Amino acid sequence: SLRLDKFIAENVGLTRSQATKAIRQSAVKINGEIVKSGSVQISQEDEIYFEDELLTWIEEGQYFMLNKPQGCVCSNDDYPTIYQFFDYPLAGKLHSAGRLDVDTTGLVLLTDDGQWSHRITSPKHHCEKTYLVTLADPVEENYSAACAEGILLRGEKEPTKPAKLEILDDYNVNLTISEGRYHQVKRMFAALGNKVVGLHRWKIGDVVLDESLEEGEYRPLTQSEIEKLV
Amino acid sequence: SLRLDKFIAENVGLTRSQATKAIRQSAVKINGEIVKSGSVQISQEDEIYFEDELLTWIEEGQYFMLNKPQGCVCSNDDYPTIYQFFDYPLAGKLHSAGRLDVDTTGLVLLTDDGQWSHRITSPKHHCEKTYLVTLADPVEENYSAACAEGILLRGEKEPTKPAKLEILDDYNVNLTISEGRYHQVKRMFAALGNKVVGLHRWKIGDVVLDESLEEGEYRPLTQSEIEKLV
């Protein structure tokens, strides 16, 4: 067996200090339990989680893009999960690099590489995520400026970071955000007096969801896509 | 008349900088519409909202505690509101010091004092709120430690601040939090693998909900209670 902090540092690509801080911030679990000590000994009989993503003991280097349908979640284990779209043992070696809510559709990246996935979801790297947002009511003239300036939402201590809004038509826009607060997009438009009736992610960084993928289908990423994301 | 930013600063008790930021961040409305220009002139007849709480220009000093029932919301706007329990014009000169979701019951403080209410709900402050929480599945031994040491919720950059959990029985607990993150209580228990099926607030600071109040009933706060929340 080996130390939890050594495992987290090496598998998530963090310094021992960063791994220690993550552990202190309740970001690390052993078999579903929050663990606050980096000295705890672990083995392959243990399932290790970082920000709720299951890390594999046998990393090989696998990367995929999935077109997620509604009605399923991005957890390894109420609703079915995205792992139903993969066969075992492959399904058991993967975790996600940015989850999508149960009814949000689109681009979900799956990988067995914890260093790669963390770089993608790390706030510091502020990776851009673009969503096709369909609204119940017509877009208003103040939307673009509000998104660019930032919106102070109830339940938040800070306003949303500047986001880029692109109007497609009166009921559809593309919104690019470099963060992912709880139900952020839904809350942003609700704050503006509208309602999100459709949410589809089609881009992360410079990687676009393969439009030939039906919902539930996935394909391996190309080396170019893998490299562009980090 | 006066500038929207002067009104917000004086009424909510913010610095001119904070007021300017809140307005630019779409947290302020004039007669139900978001206004991002602090220079806009307003009269006593205009209805000003800060994060959807209706403020009062000429404060008289009213403070009440209401026992909120399920099926109603805390706002002036799908369901009936808690202001239905008040007669006009009083109902139109009050706002809350901490809102509860539609099916959450219990203690809601109503007032026309923007500074008093702001301090109670301000993220910069740490006013304690205690809830009787009923869960779908049995509570677990480690719940207390988890709440005391912090839980990292999806959508958050930092773990929840220290909270106090008291187990009452197999499906009920009292949880005291000094934070106000979006749907925090529900998300905390969801993170622990459970589900809140019942939620009743009975204490804010050292002020306890009057047990003699039937749902829908309210009473004025005593001077002692008003001061305890100062």
Curated annotation (Swiss-Prot), chains A, B:
Single Gene Ontology BP annotation: enzyme-directed rRNA pseudouridine synthesis
Question: What are the positions of the active site?
Answer: 101
Identify the species of origin: Haemophilus influenzae (strain ATCC 51907 / DSM 11121 / KW20 / Rd)
Biological role stated in the UniProt entry: Responsible for synthesis of pseudouridine from uracil-516 in 16S ribosomal RNA.
Q: What class of enzyme is it?
A: isomerase
Give the signal peptide as a residue range, or say none if absent.
none
Q: Where is the S4 RNA-binding domain?
A: 3-69
Q: Which domain of life is it from?
A: Bacteria
Molecular-function annotations in GO = 16S rRNA pseudouridine(516) synthase activity; pseudouridine synthase activity; RNA binding
- EC number assigned by the record: 5.4.99.19
Keyword field? Isomerase, RNA-binding, rRNA processing
For this entry, the protein name equals Ribosomal small subunit pseudouridine synthase A
Family named by the database record: Belongs to the pseudouridine synthase RsuA family.
Q: Which Gene3D superfamilies match?
A: Alpha-L RNA-binding motif, Pseudouridine synthase I, catalytic domain, N-terminal subdomain, RNA-binding S4 domain
Catalysed reaction(s)? uridine(516) in 16S rRNA = pseudouridine(516) in 16S rRNA
What is one term from the GO cellular component aspect held by the record?
cytosol
Respond yes or no to whether keyword rRNA processing is given for this record: yes
